[PDB]
Scaffold this active site. Structure first.
Site, PDB file in Angstrom:
ATOM      1  N   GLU A  40       0.503  -0.852   0.050  1.00  0.00           N
ATOM      2  CA  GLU A  40       0.121   0.192  -0.286  1.00  0.00           C
ATOM      3  C   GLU A  40       0.896   1.599  -0.039  1.00  0.00           C
ATOM      4  O   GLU A  40       0.997   1.646   0.833  1.00  0.00           O
ATOM      5  CB  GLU A  40      -1.194  -0.105   1.234  1.00  0.00           C
ATOM      6  CG  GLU A  40      -1.738   0.920   0.958  1.00  0.00           C
ATOM      7  CD  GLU A  40      -3.017   0.329  -0.072  1.00  0.00           C
ATOM      8  OE1 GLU A  40      -3.350  -0.698  -0.735  1.00  0.00           O
ATOM      9  OE2 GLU A  40      -3.458   1.481  -0.871  1.00  0.00           O
ATOM     10  N   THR A  45      -2.372   4.377  -7.583  1.00  0.00           N
ATOM     11  CA  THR A  45      -2.310   5.784  -8.074  1.00  0.00           C
ATOM     12  C   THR A  45      -1.302   6.085  -9.418  1.00  0.00           C
ATOM     13  O   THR A  45      -1.625   6.715 -10.189  1.00  0.00           O
ATOM     14  CB  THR A  45      -2.627   6.601  -7.402  1.00  0.00           C
ATOM     15  OG1 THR A  45      -2.642   6.208  -5.593  1.00  0.00           O
ATOM     16  CG2 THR A  45      -2.339   7.966  -6.854  1.00  0.00           C
ATOM     17  N   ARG A  59      -9.779 -14.945 -22.425  1.00  0.00           N
ATOM     18  CA  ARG A  59      -8.586 -14.491 -22.037  1.00  0.00           C
ATOM     19  C   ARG A  59      -9.358 -14.797 -20.342  1.00  0.00           C
ATOM     20  O   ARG A  59     -10.466 -14.346 -19.180  1.00  0.00           O
ATOM     21  CB  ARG A  59      -8.283 -13.104 -22.115  1.00  0.00           C
ATOM     22  CG  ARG A  59      -8.712 -11.629 -21.251  1.00  0.00           C
ATOM     23  CD  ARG A  59      -7.917 -10.282 -21.834  1.00  0.00           C
ATOM     24  NE  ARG A  59      -7.764 -10.185 -22.843  1.00  0.00           N
ATOM     25  CZ  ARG A  59      -8.414 -10.198 -24.066  1.00  0.00           C
ATOM     26  NH1 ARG A  59      -9.984  -9.674 -23.219  1.00  0.00           N
ATOM     27  NH2 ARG A  59      -7.997  -9.427 -25.592  1.00  0.00           N
ATOM     28  N   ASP A  81       4.781  -4.758 -13.626  1.00  0.00           N
ATOM     29  CA  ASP A  81       3.728  -4.756 -11.839  1.00  0.00           C
ATOM     30  C   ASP A  81       3.770  -6.166 -11.470  1.00  0.00           C
ATOM     31  O   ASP A  81       3.153  -6.870 -12.443  1.00  0.00           O
ATOM     32  CB  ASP A  81       2.237  -3.691 -11.880  1.00  0.00           C
ATOM     33  CG  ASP A  81       2.402  -3.573 -10.537  1.00  0.00           C
ATOM     34  OD1 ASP A  81       3.416  -3.854  -9.328  1.00  0.00           O
ATOM     35  OD2 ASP A  81       0.851  -2.726 -10.098  1.00  0.00           O
ATOM     36  N   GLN A  85       3.523 -10.834  -7.300  1.00  0.00           N
ATOM     37  CA  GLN A  85       4.283 -12.019  -6.827  1.00  0.00           C
ATOM     38  C   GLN A  85       4.374 -12.378  -5.327  1.00  0.00           C
ATOM     39  O   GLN A  85       5.915 -11.657  -5.302  1.00  0.00           O
ATOM     40  CB  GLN A  85       5.145 -11.876  -7.813  1.00  0.00           C
ATOM     41  CG  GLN A  85       4.354 -12.412  -9.192  1.00  0.00           C
ATOM     42  CD  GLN A  85       4.834 -14.464  -8.833  1.00  0.00           C
ATOM     43  OE1 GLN A  85       5.825 -14.858  -8.952  1.00  0.00           O
ATOM     44  NE2 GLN A  85       3.807 -14.433  -9.769  1.00  0.00           N
TER      45      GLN A  85
END
Ligand SMILES: C/C=C\C/C=C\C/C=C/C/C=C/CCCC(=O)O[C@H](COC(=O)CCCCCCCCCCCCC)COP(=O)(O)O[C@H]1[C@H](O)[C@@H](O)[C@H](OP(=O)(O)O)[C@@H](O)[C@H]1O
Ligand SMILES: CC(C)CCC[C@@H](C)[C@H]1CC[C@H]2[C@@H]3CC=C4C[C@@H](O)CC[C@]4(C)[C@H]3CC[C@]12C
Ligand SMILES: CC(C)CCC[C@@H](C)[C@H]1CC[C@H]2[C@@H]3CC=C4C[C@@H](O)CC[C@]4(C)[C@H]3CC[C@]12C
Ligand SMILES: CC(C)CCC[C@@H](C)[C@H]1CC[C@H]2[C@@H]3CC=C4C[C@@H](O)CC[C@]4(C)[C@H]3CC[C@]12C
Ligand SMILES: CN1C[C@@H]2c3cc(Cl)ccc3Oc3ccccc3[C@@H]2C1
Lengths: 235, 288, 336, 57
Positions: A40, A45, A59, A81, A85
């Site tokens: 976070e 953003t 998909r 990004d 993971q």
């Protein structure tokens, strides 16, 4: 050798090889960026700030890696990004060798808060641990880092009550936005051991026009120009 | 005497052909060194190799014997090949300077529109200019004084041809390079210039170090191009126009001539044997 | 809690039983055996066409065709005899870390940083390859995958779990839990009845396909295990690790037999494989080369130098004629 | 983290109660297999170029 099937196979091999060269040239014209940061820390953003009006140029949901395509001033950008993971980083961090730059997002307002994993671990001390880890890998010696300092206005409101000394005990000084932002910025840029090879570009995320995308553009062009001066022998 | 000159010019040709073949070979068989920049450096090595095998041996013979012993026809070929391969060499040094310029000053073109076809077109244009300078003397622009003496293999030295083949071969190439590398220098200096105190001191020291690297590099490139070919092309413009009482000491003639041809030995050293990408690929091939 | 005391005494029981079964090391028994002799393999083919790091390859059962994967999002199918590109599949995600080629010769698989296994129908009515199935459910990157048959596939993932899937249905039938680290490798038994897996917890474990239970555990390495391979017999396997050494474990003895190490190797092993008769153990390394070991002697018999970058994938032909090694320099080289 | 420990101990007693054999018998079986098939493997002994599809067809 001279059989009809052999000639057909050679022609098919030629057709395939031409398509593969055409695909490799098209793919070489993109700028690849690795997006990192805490959970976070305002990554979403930033992602949204990049894709406002220009995007993408049964998909199944991938959930592993997120792709973001955006164009800005005749330059096409790829941003990856890897925040979802949750595994051993060192097993797949070498796959991203060769990216143009790394975008690291820190939330300035995280200093009071602590991680849910354990109370005696400030969220910003984990941020510096991650920054030190990624900045000094053997794969990322020459990769420049774009550093985003998010949530400036919530950071400002907090420091009227809670001092920055709770995050940095050794700190001693007045309490205001400018002198705390400067101190935190100097703290994160001190973690750079490869001073001669890589450079850190720091910014404070504003919500005004596309000044955040302009910063990324101006930093990526600087990186490219400096790479070409080093190759020429003038840097 | 002639033993001495034949072995001093003999080693020069050997070191030249060796130095240039090595560069082309490295490029040929190394996949790392297959970029637009190293194609233009590799083509300079081809051109400079062609000079060192075709012109330089036939020129060393005219020096050690002090006579031309190959006939009028071979000499017309010698002169044409001398004005073709050497002009192409000086315009390859400008192709590299325009490529370097378009990369420091234009990142968008670098990322988007830069392909090996650029290098192919640049090399083709270089050779086209070489032909356009070397062909006129065959089809006109020729004086009977060239063929008057069989024991001589000089150039037309027509006044208009002197202006043409002296401005189009050195003086215009020179102006272009002085402008492009000055612009590159200004762009470099900008990017360089733009406890906390220790950090400040460290950054100040790094800036000065990088401002000494760039000045040294630019000084090497231009001060090897100038000190090779300028002494020659000054004399080659003055002598034909100022005939009366301008005796050229024979000794000085040869020093100036072979100081020019030494550019084909020094070009591989500065463009290839200094950048690590080449130097490290030489390590690789040496170790099997 | 207080269940750790019972767990500890059971650990001690296993240890004491394994020790009673040790009576003579492989190296005392294979002592009158004539050494193999220096092995001279010389690269026969060099396949070109990939523009990025190769990560995986798998031979076909017909011992002629093979598939490879690269970070440029291409899955090329080669003809090794003639060096001909037969197919070239564009992947949706270019972050691919593994691939497999079906024993029947009709399907291929893929997977990587996208937590999805994609299966392609090579043999169709139009000659154009399309994505037959996509398998989702893993929480981490797909590390390995192997076709159990034409309709079942076994996958391992970085969520510390393995899974068996039904391609026709699309959902995982069985889940194998018990590992505490990322599962990096996987190897099917010759009879396709069992399979082993290596993980980041420095242990190797054996699984039963039907029951979905762990039968055995193996702790010989001190760091991550990156590769694993069954012995041709089916009663032993080899593991490659970051310890700069590979080890051989035996199912019936429940302990390691051999340790292949040398002072000149300090990198990690990326791949291992066995020859047709099991006498040779070929291992790829980060040192850009592949070292050939004698399985019964632990001495080098040859080196497959010739790759410019790290050797990432490796494979031996089903008939044993030739061996192929891919690398990070984007070249596959068949050695034979 | 308590049910974890119970599952752990329940597995360890299944892996302790299994039939183990002597390391010598296993080694003998592996070597019997190795020199059992020692002729079938071209990597061990170089094959003539007439029978080799990767050198001359
Ligand atoms: C008075 C005040 C001030 C002035 C006084 C003193 C200071 C300056 C003096 C004048 C300078 C002289 C030459 C300096 C050369 C020098 O410093 O070279 C450096 C050291 O390399 C070696 O030592 C190794 C080089 C080996 C080369 C090959 C040798 C053998 C060739 C044989 C050829 C014939 C036979 C085959 C290497 O280069 P560098 O450190 O100078 O830095 C740059 C170089 O100048 C750029 O050219 C190069 O770009 P490129 O054009 O693509 O190559 C850049 O990448 C970079 O390498
Ligand atoms: C007899 C004459 C004509 C030839 C003698 C041999 C030639 C090849 C020699 C003589 C002087 C030499 C140069 C002397 C100094 C340097 C600086 C060094 O940092 C790079 C190599 C370089 C640039 C040498 C290259 C080789 C060189 C040009
Ligand atoms: C004539 C052929 C062999 C070339 C040999 C180099 C000769 C010409 C010498 C003489 C004057 C020299 C320059 C003198 C001044 C400087 C400034 C210094 O801070 C960097 C080196 C540099 C730029 C030198 C480069 C080499 C140089 C050009
Ligand atoms: C590569 C760089 C360092 C070489 C610089 C020195 C060059 C210009 C020197 C080295 C050997 C020299 C030659 C040696 C012998 C003679 C014979 C004489 O009757 C006329 C000059 C002439 C023909 C010289 C010309 C200049 C020459 C070629
Ligand atoms: C010694 N040769 C002479 C010849 C040349 C002579 C005159 Cl007057 C004009 C043009 C020339 O072409 C060029 C062009 C560039 C460099 C060298 C030469 C060669 C070098």
């Amino acid at each position: 050798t001279l059989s009809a099937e052999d000639k057909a196979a050679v022609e098919r091999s030629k057709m395939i090889d031409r398509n593969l060269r055409e695909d490799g040239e098209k793919a070489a014209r993109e700028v690849k960026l690795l997006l990192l940061g805490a959970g976070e820390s305002g990554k979403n953003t930033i992602v949204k700030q990049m894709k406002i009006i220009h995007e993408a140029g049964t998909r199944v949901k991938t959930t592993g890696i997120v792709e973001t395509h955006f164009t800005f001033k005749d330059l096409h950008f790829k941003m990856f990004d890897v925040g979802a993971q949750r595994s051993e980083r060192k097993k797949w961090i070498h796959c991203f060798e060769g990216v143009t730059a790394i975008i690291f997002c820190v939330a300035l307002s995280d200093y009071d808060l602590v991680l849910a994993e354990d109370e005696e671990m400030n969220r910003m001390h984990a941020s510096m641990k991650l920054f030190d880890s990624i900045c000094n890998n053997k794969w990322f010696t020459d990769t420049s880092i774009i550093l985003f300092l998010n949530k400036k206005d919530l950071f400002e409101e907090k420091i009227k009550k809670s001092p920055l000394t709770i995050c940095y005990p050794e700190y001693a000084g007045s309490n205001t936005y400018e002198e705390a932002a400067a101190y935190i910025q100097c703290q994160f840029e001190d973690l750079n051991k490869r001073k001669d090879t890589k450079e850190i570009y720091t910014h404070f995320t504003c919500s005004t026009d596309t000044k955040n995308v302009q910063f990324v553009f101006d930093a990526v062009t600087d990186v490219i120009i400096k790479n070409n001066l080093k190759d020429c022998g003038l840097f | 005497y002639q033993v001495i000159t034949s072995l001093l010019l003999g080693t020069l040709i050997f070191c030249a052909v060796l130095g240039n073949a090595c560069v082309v070979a490295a490029i040929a068989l190394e996949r790392s060194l297959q970029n637009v920049a190293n194609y233009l450096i590799g083509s300079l090595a081809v051109t400079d190799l062609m000079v060192s095998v075709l012109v330089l041996p036939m020129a060393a013979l005219y020096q050690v014997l002090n006579k031309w012993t190959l006939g009028q026809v071979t000499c017309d070929l010698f002169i044409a090949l001398d004005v073709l391969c050497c002009t192409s060499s000086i315009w390859h040094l400008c192709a590299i300077a325009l490529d370097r310029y378009w990369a420091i000053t234009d990142p968008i073109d670098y990322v988007n529109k830069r392909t090996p076809r650029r290098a192919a077109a640049l090399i083709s244009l270089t050779w086209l200019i070489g032909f356009l300078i070397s062909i006129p003397p065959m089809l006109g622009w020729r004086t009977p004084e060239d063929r008057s003496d069989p024991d001589a293999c000089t150039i037309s030295k027509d006044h208009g041809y002197t202006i043409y083949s002296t401005f189009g071969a050195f003086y215009i190439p020179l102006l272009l390079m002085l402008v492009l590398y000055g612009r590159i220098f200004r762009a470099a200096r900008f990017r360089i210039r733009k406890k906390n105190e220790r950090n400040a001191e460290a950054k100040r020291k790094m800036a000065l170090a990088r401002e000494r690297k760039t000045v040294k590099t630019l000084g090497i490139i231009m001060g090897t191009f100038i000190l090779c070919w300028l002494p020659f092309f000054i004399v080659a413009l003055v002598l034909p126009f100022c005939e009366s009482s301008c005796h050229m000491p024979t000794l000085l003639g040869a020093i100036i001539n072979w100081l020019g041809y030494s550019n084909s030995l020094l070009n591989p050293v500065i463009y290839a044997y200094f950048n690590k990408d080449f130097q490290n690929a030489f390590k690789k091939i040496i170790k099997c | 809690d207080q269940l750790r005391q019972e767990a500890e005494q059971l650990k001690n029981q296993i240890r004491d039983a394994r020790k009673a079964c040790a009576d003579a090391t492989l190296s005392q028994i294979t002592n009158n055996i004539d050494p193999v002799g220096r092995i001279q393999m010389r690269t026969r083919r060099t396949l070109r066409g990939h523009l990025a790091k190769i990560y995986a390859m798998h031979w076909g059962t017909d011992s002629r065709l093979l598939v490879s994967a690269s970070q440029d999002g291409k899955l090329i199918i080669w003809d090794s005899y003639t060096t001909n590109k037969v197919h070239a599949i564009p992947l949706r995600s270019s972050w691919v870390m593994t691939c497999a080629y079906a024993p029947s010769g009709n399907y291929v698989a893929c997977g990587g940083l996208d937590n999805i296994c994609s299966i392609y129908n090579l043999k169709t009515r139009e000659g154009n390859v399309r994505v037959s199935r996509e398998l989702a459910g893993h929480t981490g990157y797909l590390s390995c995958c192997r076709f159990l048959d034409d309709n079942q596939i076994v996958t391992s993932s970085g969520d510390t779990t393995c899974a068996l899937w039904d391609i026709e249905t699309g959902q995982q039938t069985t889940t194998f839990t018990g590992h505490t680290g990322d599962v990096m490798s996987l190897s099917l038994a010759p009879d396709t009845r069992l399979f082993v897996s290596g993980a980041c917890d420095a242990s190797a474990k054996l699984w039963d396909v039907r029951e979905g239970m762990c039968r055995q555990t193996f702790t010989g390495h001190e760091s991550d295990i990156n590769a694993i391979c069954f012995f041709p017999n089916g009663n032993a396997f080899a593991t490659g690790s970051d310890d700069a050494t590979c080890r051989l474990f035996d199912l019936r003895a429940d302990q390691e037999l051999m340790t292949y190490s040398h002072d000149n190797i300090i990198c990690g092993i990326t791949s291992v494989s066995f020859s047709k008769s099991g006498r040779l153990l070929l291992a790829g390394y980060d040192d850009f080369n592949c070292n050939v070991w004698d399985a019964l002697k632990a001495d080098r018999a040859g080196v497959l130098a010739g790759h410019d970058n790290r050797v990432s994938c490796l494979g031996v032909t089903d008939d044993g004629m030739a061996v192929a090694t891919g690398s990070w320099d984007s070249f596959l080289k068949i050695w034979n | 983290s308590i049910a974890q420990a119970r599952k752990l101990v329940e597995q360890l007693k299944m892996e302790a109660n299994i039939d183990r054999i002597k390391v010598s018998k296993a080694a003998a079986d592996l070597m019997a297999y190795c020199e059992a098939h020692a002729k079938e493997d071209p990597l061990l002994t170089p094959v003539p170029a007439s029978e080799n599809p990767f050198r001359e067809k």
